[PDB]
From a paper:
Seven cell shape-determining genes (csd1, csd2, csd3/hdpA, ccmA, csd4, csd5 and csd6) have been identified in H. pylori. Among them, Csd3 (also known as HdpA) is a bifunctional enzyme. Its d,d-endopeptidase activity cleaves the d-Ala4-mDAP3 peptide bond between cross-linked muramyl tetrapeptides and pentapeptides.
Among these, only the N-terminally 41-residue truncated Csd3 (Csd3Δ41) comprised of residues 42–403 was expressed in soluble form, and it yielded two different forms (the orthorhombic form 1 and the hexagonal form 2) of well diffracting crystals. The form 1 crystal contains two monomers (chains A and B) of Csd3Δ41 in the asymmetric unit. Chains A and B are related by non­crystallographic twofold symmetry. Chains A and B are highly similar to each other, with an r.m.s. deviation of 0.67 Å for 359 Cα atoms. However, they show larger structural deviations from the chain of the form 2 crystal, with r.m.s. deviations of 1.61 and 1.85 Å for 353 Cα atoms in chains A and B, respectively. In the form 1 crystal, the two monomers in the asymmetric unit bury a relatively large surface area of 1130 Å2 per monomer (6.0% of the monomer surface area), whereas the largest buried surface area in the form 2 crystal is 710 Å2 per monomer (3.8% of the monomer surface area). Loop I of Csd3 shows the most significant deviation among the homologues. In form 1 crystals, it is involved in crystal-packing interactions by forming sulfate-mediated salt bridges. Interestingly, the side chain of His339 of Csd3, the first histidine of the HxH motif, shows two different orientations. However, it is flipped about 104° towards the solvent in the form 1 crystals.
Numbering used by the authors: 41 to 332, 337 to 403
The structure:
């Protein structure tokens, strides 16, 4: 296949460019239309053409784990939503700073997304502006590969940053939140429900891809059933990055807050004065619920990846308890011992970074 980057196109633009009847999109269920509206610019996608230059296959990412597969059989085009095929590798970075964190992490890994994720995750506990030469940074993380090419975002499993005689740890959890050495949440956020709802008509789901009888489509936000006219509130502070129509979402507002993007779709109207560029405060009215039943699709992206918004709708951060805490801390202990060992057996006099396989 040709490997290409997406840039300006929408799904309907891509179909027209390639003489694929647009009914391939319009016949989709509304849920599939919603999935189709999150083709991000800058994503690597893949195409196969015949000796007449006719589009025979395209694989276009919707998320890190799901893609649109367009393909031609005989005279007909088909469109499925299917798993992205990939390999997952775990790495451990041991770094002694020589200049600047962002810059040195990139020099050691070629992975600016990793650098930026770490900076954001620590921004309220160790500002990177604070770090100096010979401070230490460790990161255990996974990276995904398709046919030898890295794609998507890394995921941090653990990190340790040392500054001013202290070590500051970050540990992932299966619940999606990150925690410090005390099993207290770090680098999260507090969201408000964006609409007064009757029920959640469709919850968030990562989907299920095997075995065949268990297969379930992902849904990368929360669909709220709400009475016609309901006002929509921003779940957070932020800045409006998009306001308008996107096929599959109808009228939609997107708000950016640091590494977050919040999506508010199927609206009837935007709030007077609101435009691209506006700053908004948590709870501020941004528009009104539409049927473009009446529903709001609320999406939350963290480091460009959809996450279950309901885990963040709360008035205080997460802190583990009970057996969850016992198990978390025992795992954290063993992680800490292993990192200490790796740091023993890896002198920074020889090399100012090491990039190791596994952990
Ligand atoms: Zn939805």
């Amino acid at each position: 296949m040709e490997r290409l980057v997406w840039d300006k196109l929408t799904l309907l633009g891509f179909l027209e460019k390639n003489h694929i009847p647009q009914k391939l999109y319009y016949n989709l269920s509304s849920q599939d239309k919603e999935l189709s509206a999150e083709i991000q610019s800058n994503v690597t996608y893949y195409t196969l053409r015949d000796a007449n230059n006719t589009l025979i296959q395209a694989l276009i990412p919707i998320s890190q784990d799901l893609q649109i597969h367009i393909y031609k059989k005989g005279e007909d085009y088909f469109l499925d939503f299917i798993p992205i095929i990939f390999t997952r590798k775990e790495k451990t970075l041991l770094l002694s700073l020589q200049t600047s964190p962002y810059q040195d992490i990139i020099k050691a890994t070629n992975d600016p997304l990793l650098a930026n994720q770490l900076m954001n995750a620590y921004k309220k506990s160790v500002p990177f502006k604070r770090l100096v030469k010979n401070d230490k940074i460790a990161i255990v993380y996974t990276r995904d590969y398709r046919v030898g090419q890295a794609f998507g975002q890394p995921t941090i499993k653990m990190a340790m940053v040392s500054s001013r005689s202290n070590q500051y740890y970050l540990f992932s959890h299966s619940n999606g939140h990150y925690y410090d050495s005390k099993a207290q949440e770090v680098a999260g956020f507090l969201l408000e429900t964006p609409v007064k709802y009757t029920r959640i008509s469709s919850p968030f789901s990562y989907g299920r891809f095997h075995p065949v009888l268990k297969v379930r489509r992902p849904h990368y936000g929360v669909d709220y059933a709400a009475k016609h006219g309901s006002l929509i509130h921003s779940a957070s502070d932020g800045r409006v990055g998009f306001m308008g129509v996107k096929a599959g979402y109808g009228k939609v507002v997107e708000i950016h807050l640091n590494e977050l993007r919040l999506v508010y779709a199927h609206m009837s109207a935007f709030a007077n004065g609101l435009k691209k560029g506006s700053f908004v405060k948590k709870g501020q009215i941004i528009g009104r619920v539409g049927s473009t039943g009446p529903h709001l699709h609320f999406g939350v992206y963290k480091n460009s990846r959809p996450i279950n918004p309901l885990g963040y709708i709360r008035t205080a951060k997460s802190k583990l308890h009970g057996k969850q805490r016992e198990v978390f801390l025992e795992k954290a202990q063993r992680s800490k011992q292993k990192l200490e060992e790796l740091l023993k057996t890896h002198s920074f006099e020889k090399n100012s970074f090491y990039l190791l396989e596994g952990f």
